[PDB]
């Protein structure tokens, strides 16, 4: 997250860190959202590599003992069947991870609430992106979980030629674009949390930014629109 602030450690208890095994250690690669005690929602592109993955719930500082973490292996990966790694602009950037154990819930570890199917946010709706991703374009991962205020940019604006044009689909949510605040590498797969009727819900899965950089004016961060995938999510969890 470029232009973020440090999250309070109990603000976003559905946020997870998706890590892969790297020699004798683990490396953060992506975010995700805990949606069942044994299921995480992330981006498909975060799991294209043939890596060994784990999920960390109750994580705040990637580099220090928080006293709240639970570490759990990924047992099964179900990528959306229409995903194509060489066409992120087509959409379908979503995957579900079944965890090897069910995590224990507490003020640091909660299920993310998803919107009702078909819900579309008014332009300029209040949302936060969260994650441990780069804090500058071509920078480094954050140590502590970051949040940035990223209001939505509706499809009509986002798909206009000075924004994303044809690259954005109605199956996506755009947010931000102010040139200061954005998602960045390492945020992918994590949530966009939007305040609706007094409660935050996870409306987006972080998918892409411009090839020119993270915080580029009129290139809002692009997310998979969770509310387009409710039936898919429910069907995968029911069949696995």
Residues 149-178 that bind Ca ion (CB under 5 A): none
Residue 235, φ and ψ in degrees, nearest 5: -65, -40
- Residue 66 in contact with Ca ion, rule: CB under 5 A: yes
Report in angstroms how near the CB of residue 74 gets to Ca ion at its nearest: 19
Q: Tell me the two tokens of residue 11.
A: 């603000």
Q: Return the number of the residue (64 or 239) whose C-beta is nearest Ca ion.
A: 64
> 156: how many CB neighbours lie within 10 A of its CB?
9
Least separation in angstroms between residue 66's CB and Ca ion is: 4
Residue 76: both structure tokens together: 């099964």
Tell the burial category of 202 from Cβ atoms under 10 Å away from its Cβ (0-12, 13-18, 19+).
buried
Q: Please state whether 92 falls in left (phi above 0), alpha (psi between -120 and 50) or beta.
A: left
Nearer to Ca ion, 26 or 149 (CB): 26
Rounded least distance, CB 62 to Ca ion, Å: 6
Size of the site for Ca ion (CB under 5 A): 2
- Is 28 annotated as catalytic? no
135 vs 1: CA distance, rounded Å: 5
Distances in Å between the Cα of 109 and the Cα atoms of 11, 58, 60, 140, 158 are 10, 5, 11, 26, 33
Binding residue per annotation — 6? no
Task: Assess whether 45 carries a catalytic annotation.
Answer: yes
Three-state secondary structure call for residue 236: helix
Quote the least distance from Cβ 60 to Ca ion, whole Å.
6
Residue 93: active-site member: yes
Task: Give whichever of 11 and 61 is closer to Ca ion, judged by the CB atom.
Answer: 61
- 5-64: contacts with Ca ion (CB under 5 A): 61
Q: Is 69 annotated as a binding residue?
A: yes
Q: Which residue is nearest to Ca ion (CB)?
A: 66
Q: Which residue numbers are catalytic?
A: 45, 93, 188
Binding site for Ca(2+): which residues? 59, 61, 64, 69
Q: Which residues bind Ca ion (CB under 5 A)?
A: 61, 66
């Amino acid at each position: 997250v470029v232009g973020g602030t440090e999250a309070q450690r109990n603000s976003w208890p559905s946020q997870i860190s998706l890590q892969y095994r790297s020699g004798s250690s683990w490396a953060h690669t992506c975010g995700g959202t805990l949606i069942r005690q044994n299921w995480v929602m992330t981006a498909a592109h975060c799991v294209d590599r043939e890596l060994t993955f784990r999920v960390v719930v109750g994580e705040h500082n990637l580099n220090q003992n928080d006293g709240t973490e639970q570490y759990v292996g990924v047992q099964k990966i179900v990528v959306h069947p229409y995903w194509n790694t060489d066409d992120v602009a087509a959409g379908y950037d979503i995957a579900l991870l079944r965890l090897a154990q069910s995590v224990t819930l507490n003020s640091y570890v909660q299920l993310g609430v998803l919107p009702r199917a078909g819900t579309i946010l008014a332009n300029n709706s209040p949302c936060y992106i969260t994650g441990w991703g780069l804090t500058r374009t071509n920078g480094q991962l954050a140590q502590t979980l970051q949040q940035a205020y990223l209001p939505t940019v509706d499809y009509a604006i986002c798909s206009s030629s000075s924004y994303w044009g044809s690259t954005v689909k109605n199956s996506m949510v755009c947010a931000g674009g102010d040139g200061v605040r954005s998602g960045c590498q390492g945020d992918s797969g994590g949530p966009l949390h939007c305040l609706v009727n007094g409660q935050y819900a996870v409306h987006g899965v972080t998918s892409f930014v411009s090839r020119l950089g993270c915080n580029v004016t009129r290139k809002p961060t692009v997310f998979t629109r969770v509310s387009a995938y409710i039936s898919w999510i429910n069907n995968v969890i029911a069949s696995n």
